[PDB]
Structure 1
Amino acid sequence: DTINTKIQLVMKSGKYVLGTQQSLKTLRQGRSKLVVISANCPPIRKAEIEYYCTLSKTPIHHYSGNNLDLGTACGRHFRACVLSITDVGDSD
């Protein structure tokens, strides 16, 4: 997938955080360039993250898979409900 290839590039030469707590921390500090949210996110937690992104003027990408698929797309053996990219490397 197009998004899957870009995530692989960021994993190699970029900066990121995985998880809800760390993603909100970067949103408060204003060091977020893109937020990817899995389709598995609980409705009330997704509403909070979208509100934070609107305040900080950060684009949102709605992932098609669930947290199991998003976690493996980062070369991990665990699940991740949200991914926040702080420094796009040689990617787009």
Structure 2
Amino acid sequence: SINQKLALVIKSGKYTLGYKSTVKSLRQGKSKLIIIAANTPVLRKSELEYYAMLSKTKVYYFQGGNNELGTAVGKLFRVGVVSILEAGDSDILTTL
């Protein structure tokens, strides 16, 4: 699955959470990948997609709402999108 990959990301590499932080990171291009929750507002999703294509960064559409995305990334609150700074030890960048 993918969730254990994200767990490896959390324990090993570097990341960031939340819309403001992710757009900030993507602004200087420190991001390698972004993951977007399903139920996010479509306007916001499209804007993030446009930023991604502008910065040549990969995007992955999670199969679920922000709530369980929060559980997958192993925090307690809900998260809209996540940005992967350094994979650290994960294969997410290489695969998919």
TM-score range, shorter chain: over 0.9
Structure 1 unaligned segments of length 5 or more: list them.
none
SS of equivalent to 1:5: helix
- For the residues of structure 1 that align with 2:42 and 2:87, how far apart are their CA atoms? 28
CA distance in structure 1 between the aligned counterparts of 2:85 and 2:74, rounded to whole angstroms = 18
- Structure 1 stretches of at least 4 aligned residues deviating more than 6 Å after TM superposition: none
5+ residue gaps, structure 2, are: 92-96
Q: CA deviation at 1:74?
A: 1.5
What TM-score does the superposition give when structure 1 sets the normalisation length?
Answer: 0.96
- Residue 61 of structure 1 aligns with which residue? 60
Query: CA RMSD of the aligned region, Å?
Result: 0.6
Separation in structure 2 between the aligned mates of residue 71 and residue 52 of structure 1, nearest angstrom: 23
Report the counterpart of residue 94 of structure 2 in structure 1.
none
Q: TM-score, normalised by structure 2?
A: 0.92
Tell me the CA shift for residue 88 of structure 1: 0.5
State how many pairs are aligned: 91
